[PDB]
Amino acid sequence: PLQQTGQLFGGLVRDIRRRYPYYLSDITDAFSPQVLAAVIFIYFAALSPAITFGGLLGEKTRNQMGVSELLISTAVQGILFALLGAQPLLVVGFSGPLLVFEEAFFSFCETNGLEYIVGRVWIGFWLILLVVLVVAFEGSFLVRFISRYTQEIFSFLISLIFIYETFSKLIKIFQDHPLQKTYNYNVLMVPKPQGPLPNTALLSLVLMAGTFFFAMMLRKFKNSSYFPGKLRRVIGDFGVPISILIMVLVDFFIQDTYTQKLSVPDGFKVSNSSARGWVIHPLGLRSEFPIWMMFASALPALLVFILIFLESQITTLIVSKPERKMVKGSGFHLDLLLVVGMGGVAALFGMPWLSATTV
Amino acid sequence: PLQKTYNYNVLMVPKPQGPLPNTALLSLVLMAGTFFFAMMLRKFKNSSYFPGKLRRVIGDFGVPISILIMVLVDFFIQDTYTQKLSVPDGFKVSNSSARGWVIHPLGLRSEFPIWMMFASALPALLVFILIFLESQITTLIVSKPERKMVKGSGFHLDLLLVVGMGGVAALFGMPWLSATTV
Amino acid sequence: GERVQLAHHFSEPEITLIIFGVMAGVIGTILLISYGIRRL
Ligand SMILES: CCCCCCCC(=O)OC[C@H](COP(=O)(O)O[C@@H]1[C@H](O)[C@H](O)[C@@H](OP(=O)(O)O)[C@H](OP(=O)(O)O)[C@H]1O)OC(=O)CCCCCCC
Ligand SMILES: CCCCCCCC(=O)OC[C@H](COP(=O)(O)O[C@@H]1[C@H](O)[C@H](O)[C@@H](OP(=O)(O)O)[C@H](OP(=O)(O)O)[C@H]1O)OC(=O)CCCCCCC
Ligand SMILES: CC(C)CCC[C@@H](C)[C@H]1CC[C@H]2[C@@H]3CC=C4C[C@@H](O)CC[C@]4(C)[C@H]3CC[C@]12C
Ligand SMILES: *[C@@H]1O[C@H](CO)[C@@H](O)[C@H](O)[C@H]1NC(C)=O
- Asked if A294 is an interface residue toward chain C (Cβ–Cβ < 8 A), one would say no
Close Cβ partners of C2 (under 8 Å, ≥ 6 residues apart): A270, A273, A274, A276, A277
Interchain contact C/B (3 or more Cβ pairs less than 8 Å): no
Contact B131, B162 (CB under 8 A): yes
What does the angle CA A12 – CA A15 – CA A19 come to, to the nearest 5 degrees? 140
Burial B38-67 (b: 16+ CB within 10 A, else e): beebeeeeeeeeeeeeebeeebeebeeebe
Ligand 3 pocket check for A348: Cβ under 6 Å: no
User: Which amino acid would we find at residue B148?
Assistant: K
Compare all CA atoms of chain B with the CA of A186 and give the residue at the minimum distance: B5
CA A15 to chain centre: 24
Q: How far is Cα A106 from Cα A61, in angstroms, rounded to an integer?
A: 6
Q: What ligand is nearest to the CA atom of residue B57?
A: 2
The DSSP letter of residue B157 is H
Interface test with B, best of A173, A174, A177, A179 (most B CBs within 10 A): A179
Interface test with B, best of A181, A187, A200, A256 (most B CBs within 10 A): A181
What does the angle CA A31 – CA A35 – CA A37 come to, to the nearest 5 degrees? 130
Close Cβ partners of A288 (under 8 Å, ≥ 6 residues apart): C6
- How far is CA A288 from each of CA A291, A299, A349, C21, rounded to the nearest angstrom? 9, 21, 18, 22
Sign, CA torsion A95/A237/A79/A59:
negative
Residue with CA nearest ligand 4 atom 10:
A62
Q: Least CB-CB distance to C6: which of A270, A273, A287?
A: A287
- How far is CA B93 from each of CA B102, B103, B174, rounded to the nearest angstrom? 10, 12, 10
How many Cβ atoms from other residues are within 10 Å of residue A13's Cβ? 14
How many Cβ atoms from other residues are within 10 Å of residue A184's Cβ? 12
C-alpha A298 to ligand 3 mean position (Å): 13
Our CA-based measurement puts residue A12 at a distance from the nearest CA of chain C, in whole angstroms, of 16
Q: How far is Cα A42 from Cα A118, in angstroms, rounded to an integer?
A: 32
C-alpha B45 to ligand 2 mean position (Å): 14
Question: Do the chains contact at C30 and A133, CB–CB below 8 Å?
Answer: yes
Contact A9, A135 (CB under 8 A): yes
Contact A60, A106 (CB under 8 A): yes
Compare all CA atoms of chain B with the CA of A199 and give the residue at the minimum distance: B22
Q: How far is Cα A154 from Cα A160, in angstroms, rounded to an integer?
A: 10
How many Cβ atoms from other residues are within 10 Å of residue B123's Cβ? 9
Breaks in chain A listed by the residue before each, with C–N > 2.5 Å: none
Contact A120, A347 (CB under 8 A): yes
Question: Do the chains contact at A8 and C5, CB–CB below 8 Å?
Answer: no
Helix locations, B47-173, DSSP H:
52-60, 62-75, 114-119, 121-142, 155-171
Q: Can you count the helices (H) and strands (E) in chain B?
A: 6, 0
- Asked if A9 is an interface residue toward chain C (Cβ–Cβ < 8 A), one would say no
- The DSSP-derived string for A129-190 is HHHHHHHHTTGGGGGGG--HHHHHHHHHHHHHHHHHHHHHHHHHHHHHS---S---S----S
Nearest to B42 by CA among B17, B66, B13: B66
Q: How far is Cα B176 from Cα C15, in angstroms, rounded to an integer?
A: 97
CA B152 to chain centre: 27
Q: Where does residue A168 rank: exposed (0-12), middle (13-18), buried (19+ CB within 10 A)?
A: exposed
Q: Could you give phi then psi for residue B160, rounded to 5 degrees?
A: -60, -45
The DSSP letter of residue A242 is H
Q: How far is Cα A280 from Cα A299, in angstroms, rounded to an integer?
A: 21
Angle between helices A148-176 and A298-319 (to 10 degrees): 100
Nearest to A118 by CA among A269, A279, A270, A274: A279
- The DSSP-derived string for B77-90 is --SS--------SS
Find chain C residues with C-beta within 8 A of A287's C-beta.
6
Method by which the coordinates were obtained: cryo-EM
The DSSP letter of residue B61 is T
Largest CA distance in chain B: 69
3-state secondary structure of A267: coil
CA atoms within a 13 Å half-sphere pointing along the CA-CB vector of A346: 25
Burial C12-40 (b: 16+ CB within 10 A, else e): beeebeebeeeeeeeeeeebeeeeeeeee
The DSSP letter of residue A274 is T
Say how many residues make up chain A.
359
First to last CA, chain C: 52
Close Cβ partners of A275 (under 8 Å, ≥ 6 residues apart): A62, A63, A64, A117
What does the angle CA B174 – CA B178 – CA B179 come to, to the nearest 5 degrees? 140
